[PDB]
Amino acid sequence: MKELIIVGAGGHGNEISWLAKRCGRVVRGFLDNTVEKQGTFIRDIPVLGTLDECSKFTDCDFVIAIGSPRARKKIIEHFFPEGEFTFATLIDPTATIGENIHIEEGTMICAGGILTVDVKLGKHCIVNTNAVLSHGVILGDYVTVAPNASISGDVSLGNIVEIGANATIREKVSVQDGAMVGMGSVVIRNILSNQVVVGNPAKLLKVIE
Amino acid sequence: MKELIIVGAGGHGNEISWLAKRCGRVVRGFLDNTVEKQGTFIRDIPVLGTLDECSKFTDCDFVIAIGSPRARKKIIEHFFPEGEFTFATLIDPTATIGENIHIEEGTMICAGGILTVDVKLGKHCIVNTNAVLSHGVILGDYVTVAPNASISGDVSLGNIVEIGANATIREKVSVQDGAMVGMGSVVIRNILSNQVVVGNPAKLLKVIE
Amino acid sequence: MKELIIVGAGGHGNEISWLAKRCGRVVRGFLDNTVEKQGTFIRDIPVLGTLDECSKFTDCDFVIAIGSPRARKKIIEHFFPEGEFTFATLIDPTATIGENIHIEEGTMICAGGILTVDVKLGKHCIVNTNAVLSHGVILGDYVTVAPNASISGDVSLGNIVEIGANATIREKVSVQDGAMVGMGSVVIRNILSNQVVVGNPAKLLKVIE
Ligand SMILES: CC(=O)SCCNC(=O)CCNC(=O)[C@H](O)C(C)(C)COP(=O)(O)OP(=O)(O)OC[C@H]1O[C@@H](n2cnc3c(N)ncnc32)[C@H](O)[C@@H]1OP(=O)(O)O
Ligand SMILES: CC(=O)SCCNC(=O)CCNC(=O)[C@H](O)C(C)(C)COP(=O)(O)OP(=O)(O)OC[C@H]1O[C@@H](n2cnc3c(N)ncnc32)[C@H](O)[C@@H]1OP(=O)(O)O
Ligand SMILES: CC(=O)SCCNC(=O)CCNC(=O)[C@H](O)C(C)(C)COP(=O)(O)OP(=O)(O)OC[C@H]1O[C@@H](n2cnc3c(N)ncnc32)[C@H](O)[C@@H]1OP(=O)(O)O
Ligand SMILES: Cc1cn([C@H]2C[C@H](O)[C@@H](COP(=O)(O)OP(=O)(O)O)O2)c(=O)[nH]c1=O
Ligand SMILES: Cc1cn([C@H]2C[C@H](O)[C@@H](COP(=O)(O)OP(=O)(O)O)O2)c(=O)[nH]c1=O
Ligand SMILES: Cc1cn([C@H]2C[C@H](O)[C@@H](COP(=O)(O)OP(=O)(O)O)O2)c(=O)[nH]c1=O
Ligand code: NA
Ligand code: NA
Numbered sequence: 001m002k003e004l005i006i007v008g009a010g011g012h013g014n015e016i017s018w019l020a021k022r023c024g025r026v027v028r029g030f031l032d033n034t035v036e037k038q039g040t041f042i043r044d045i046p047v048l049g050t051l052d053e054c055s056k057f058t059d060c061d062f063v064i065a066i067g068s069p070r071a072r073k074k075i076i077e078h079f080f081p082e083g084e085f086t087f088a089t090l091i092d093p094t095a096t097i098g099e100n101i102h103i104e105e106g107t108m109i110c111a112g113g114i115l116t117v118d119v120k121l122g123k124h125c126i127v128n129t130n131a132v133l134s135h136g137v138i139l140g141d142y143v144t145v146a147p148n149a150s151i152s153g154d155v156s157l158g159n160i161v162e163i164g165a166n167a168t169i170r171e172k173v174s175v176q177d178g179a180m181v182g183m184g185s186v187v188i189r190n191i192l193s194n195q196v197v198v199g200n201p202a203k204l205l206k207v208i209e
Numbered sequence: 210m211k212e213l214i215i216v217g218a219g220g221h222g223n224e225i226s227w228l229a230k231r232c233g234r235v236v237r238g239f240l241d242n243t244v245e246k247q248g249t250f251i252r253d254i255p256v257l258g259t260l261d262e263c264s265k266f267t268d269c270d271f272v273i274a275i276g277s278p279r280a281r282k283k284i285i286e287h288f289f290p291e292g293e294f295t296f297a298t299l300i301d302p303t304a305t306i307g308e309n310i311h312i313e314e315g316t317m318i319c320a321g322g323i324l325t326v327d328v329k330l331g332k333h334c335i336v337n338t339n340a341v342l343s344h345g346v347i348l349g350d351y352v353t354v355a356p357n358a359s360i361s362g363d364v365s366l367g368n369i370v371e372i373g374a375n376a377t378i379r380e381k382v383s384v385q386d387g388a389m390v391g392m393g394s395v396v397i398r399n400i401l402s403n404q405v406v407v408g409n410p411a412k413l414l415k416v417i418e
Numbered sequence: 419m420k421e422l423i424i425v426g427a428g429g430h431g432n433e434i435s436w437l438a439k440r441c442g443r444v445v446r447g448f449l450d451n452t453v454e455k456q457g458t459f460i461r462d463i464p465v466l467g468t469l470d471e472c473s474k475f476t477d478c479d480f481v482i483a484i485g486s487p488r489a490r491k492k493i494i495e496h497f498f499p500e501g502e503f504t505f506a507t508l509i510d511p512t513a514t515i516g517e518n519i520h521i522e523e524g525t526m527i528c529a530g531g532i533l534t535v536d537v538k539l540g541k542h543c544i545v546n547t548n549a550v551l552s553h554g555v556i557l558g559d560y561v562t563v564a565p566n567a568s569i570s571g572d573v574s575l576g577n578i579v580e581i582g583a584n585a586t587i588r589e590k591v592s593v594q595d596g597a598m599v600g601m602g603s604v605v606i607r608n609i610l611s612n613q614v615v616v617g618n619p620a621k622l623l624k625v626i627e
Contacts, residue, residue: 011571011589014553018516018535043517043535094514096303096320098227099252111514112532112550114321114338117227117252129532129550132321132338132356135223147550148568148586150357150375152392153220166568166586166604168357168375168393171220183570184586184604184618186375186393186409200393200409200604200618305512305529307436308461323530323547326436326461341530341547341565344432359566359584361601362429377566377584377602380429395584395602395618409602409618 003028004088005057007075008066009037009047012126016065016090016108017045023090028060051079061088063106064124069142069160069178072124076106076142087123095127104141122159134171146183158193167202180208212237213297214266216284217275218246218256221335225274225299225317226254232299237269260288270297272315273333278351278369278387281333285315285351296332304336313350331368343380355392367402376411389417421446422506423475425493426484427455427465430544434483434508434526435463441508446478469497479506481524482542487560487578487596490542494524494560505541513545522559540577552589564601576611585620598626 004025006013009032020027029048030037037047054062062085064072087106091097095113106124109115113127116134122141127133129147137151140159145151148166156174157163163175164183175181179191182198182205191197194209213234215222218241229236238257239246246256263271271294273281296315300306304322315333318324322336325343331350336342338356346360349368354360357375365383366372372384373392384390388400391407391414400406403418422443424431427450438445447466448455455465472480480503482490505524509515513531524542527533531545534552540559545551547565555569558577563569566584574592575581581593582601593599597609600616600623609615612627 011553014536015534021517098320099230111516111534112321112530116224116320116338118223129534129552130339130548134338134356135220147552147570148357148566150392152356152374165570165588166375166584170374170392182604183568183588183606186391186618188392198619200395201407307529308439321530325433325529325547327432339548343547343565344429357566359601361565361583375584379583379601395600397601409604410616 001025001088002059002061002086005048005054005060005062006030006045007051007054007062007064007079008032009034009040009042010066012067013065014042015110015129016063017042019090019092019108019110020063020088022092022094022111023088025061025088025090028057051075054079054085058085061086063088063090063108065108067126067144067146067162069144069162073142073160076124110147128165140177178208210234210297211268211270211295214257214263214269214271215239215254216260216263216271216273216288217241218243218249218251219275221276222274223251224319224338225272226251228299228301228317228319229272229297231301231303231320232297234270234297234299237266260284263288263294267294270295272297272299272317274317276335276353276355276371278353278371282351282369285333319356337374349386387417419443419506420477420479420504423466423472423478423480424448424463425469425472425480425482425497426450427452427458427460428484430485431483432460433528433547434481435460437508437510437526437528438481438506440510440512440529441506443479443506443508446475469493472497472503476503479504481506481508481526483526485544485562485564485580487562487580491560491578494542528565546583558595596626 009030029046091109092111095109103121104123112130114132121139131149134153136154142160144162146165149163150168152171158177162180167185169187175191176193178194180196185202186200187202196205218239238255300318301320304318312330313332321339323341330348340358343362345363351369353371355374358372359377361380367386371389376394378396384400385402387403389405394411395409396411405414427448447464509527510529513527521539522541530548532550539557549567552571554572560578562580564583567581568586570589576595580598585603587605593609594611596612598614603620604618605620614623
């Protein structure tokens with residue numbers, strides 16, 4: 001397999017370098033724009049430079065290890081024009097991937113995650129540690145599912161949706177593009193575009209756009 | 210082992226056909242009363258007919274893959290008179306079954322579930338994906354534990370109890386027959402028969418009967 | 419390896435005898451002060467006597483299998499003077515221990531627990547079943563993390579902190595010494611010393627000292 005460039009040397013990039021290693025991949029390094037991170041390492045893996053150096057590594061697979069759905073979309077749209085780069089799909093050896101699971105390029109399925117049956121993910125999704133996506137779940141592009149999220153059957157998550165840590169989503173709930181579910185929320189109603197909901201039961205906090 | 214008939218071709222039957230396959234079982238097919246499902250398949254496995262065709266398959270093990278505790282009880286009482294049929298016990302290879310675990314016929318323990326020590330389950334129980342039953346937990350017959358439920362030590366769950374996804378139950382809590390705990394509930398008090406409780410902390414919503 | 423003495427023959431000691439067995443350890447027995455437990459067993463393992471018999475077993479490793487952080491501290495300070503005894507570190511074969519994980523003596527990591535990267539634990543910590551400690555998490559001494567707790571990145575847990583079952587802690591939150599987070603709490607603010615917080619979102623209930 002090609003060596004991997006990880007975009008993002010923060011908390012998510014730290015954990016995705018670990019995922020890559022567990023997947024048997026060689027990480028060439030990170031690209032990160034943070035001034036303080038130039039010349040730095042995570043566990044023997046160098047920050048090689050800024051995102052505008054990505055054209056130096058067309059021989060590598062990429063993943064965008066940045067938790068914010070919008071930040072991944074923005075990076076793809078600016079730095080990764082269609083067909084110029086290839087993207088890894090990283091599935092932790094301890095993740096459970098069942099039957100009729102469809103996962104598009106750039107997606108990261110972390111340790112202990114469970115996707116049961118008939119689950120569809122778009123490009124550059126994240127399913128973090130110990131999260132569960134039950135039967136018939138659909139994710140759009142650039143969806144972030146945080147650790148321990150509980151995504152019940154037939155839930156639909158639009159593009160650039162974020163589901164916070166240990167939140168719970170009732171079966172058949174639809175979450176429209178750009179919405180965010182706070183950590184620990186108990187979601188029993190559909191959510192409209194760009195809405196942030198929090199609490200038990202989940203209620204509208206604010207709109208993100 | 211005998212081939213398996215799965216009663217219920219909905220969301221739970223979909224996931225239990227997957228469980229059966231993972232357990233090395235051959236699923237002969239589903240029985241389901243849904244008109245729209247006659248002549249249909251889940252992933253190469255046929256809906257063979259209606260529940261009143263169950264006497265055609267006495268050479269098979271059965272499981273009742275229907276999430277509603279009352280629906281499983283009703284099906285057993287009408288269609289499965291004592292000693293006429295045999296029932297599978299399905300334990301996912303990725304479920305953790307510890308020591309002095311007692312599980313009665315027809316029970317389904319799904320992927321990533323954990324039963325630690327001194328746990329007792331009655332007949333036709335479901336412990337769904339990533340749920341944890343800690344030391345001394347007792348389930349009656351026809352108990353449903355949804356994905357990611359957190360059932361602390363020495364909790365007692367009566368017959369036809371349902372514990373919703375990612376709910377949490379305080380140690381030593383008793384839940385009397387027929388009660389339901391909403392998804393995400395934080396249960397710190399005993400629950401009486403047929404009560405539905407929701408929220409954090411869990412409070413009485415309504416009575417189911 | 420040395421045979422193990424487990425201090426505490428209650429619910430936690432029951433589960434830690436199971437952990438020890440899974441770790442390939444031989445448990446010589448329990449020490450427990452409970453009058454009713456003298457001459458009793460858990461699953462072929464005897465209660466040998468009271469804690470003041472610990473000097474009879476300097477040839478054994480010890481673990482303090484008592485959930486209360488303060489009870490472990492009190493037992494260590496009274497019965498286990500510095501350098502007189504050795505302590506086991508027990509990590510369930512189904513726990514995931516990632517890279518640059520530092521765990522001090524007497525710590526118990528239970529079945530399905532996940533510590534990702536750059537996690538530091540002090541002495542006599544407990545990480546119970548299916549809990550997740552994400553990148554950069556730091557635990558002091560005598561920290562209890564209950565089943566299914568969701569401890570996000572860069573969270574700091576002081577000494578004698580207790581995090582209740584299936585609680586969720588927002589990234590970068592600091593919890594000062596002696597605080598307790600109720601089961602199912604959604605913690606989005608720092609917590610001060612000896613504070614008990616409950617609920618969604620977590621709010622001050624009382625002070626423990
Ligand atoms: C490995 C990893 O670490 S992956 C990362 C895992 N982390 C997550 O999933 C955390 C996701 N983040 C959240 O849930 C945040 O709490 C957010 C984004 C919803 C809101 O954060 P902020 O915009 O900083 O909101 P803030 O904390 O200032 O709170 C504003 C109000 O909303 C409430 N609130 C905010 N978040 C939540 C929540 N998750 N649940 C309940 N109430 C909440 C607050 O109580 C406050 O109410 P008030 O006006 O009555 O005081
Ligand atoms: C693989 C799988 O998918 S397995 C399936 C996993 N799914 C589950 O576990 C979900 C279990 N279902 C639930 O928890 C449901 O929310 C139920 C059954 C408790 C209630 O559903 P309904 O009867 O449809 O109640 P409904 O949604 O109309 O809400 C009624 C009231 O209760 C409240 N409420 C309902 N459920 C909950 C909940 N889980 N938590 C908090 N509040 C709740 C609502 O906010 C509403 O309050 P209001 O009167 O102030 O508006
Ligand atoms: C394998 C295993 O079993 S490991 C063990 C796992 N167990 C745990 O993690 C449980 C931890 N314990 C808790 O969370 C407890 O609920 C505690 C310690 C916070 C409080 O317990 P107590 O001191 O007995 O408080 P009590 O139950 O009397 O409730 C007092 C008030 O706080 C509220 N409250 C208490 N705990 C909680 C909670 N976790 N969430 C929300 N509200 C709570 C009650 O609703 C009550 O409010 P009121 O005054 O409005 O009636
Ligand atoms: C949005 C964005 C972020 N970054 C980097 C800056 C930070 O080091 C990193 C984000 O790290 P951090 O803020 O910890 O968040 P995350 O959980 O997504 O890792 O991403 C870029 O290099 N370019 C970008 O366009
Ligand atoms: C109660 C009941 C249900 N069913 C079928 C109808 C539906 O296809 C199926 C239930 O599917 P569904 O409604 O998705 O719920 P579950 O989560 O339990 O699968 O069970 C019967 O065939 N007979 C019965 O007596
Ligand atoms: C605090 C303390 C407890 N114990 C014992 C008494 C009980 O049997 C046991 C605690 O069991 P229990 O009360 O079930 O709680 P836990 O979850 O910690 O097991 O610890 C001692 O023997 N000495 C002590 O100093
Ligand atoms: Na798990
Ligand atoms: Na959870």
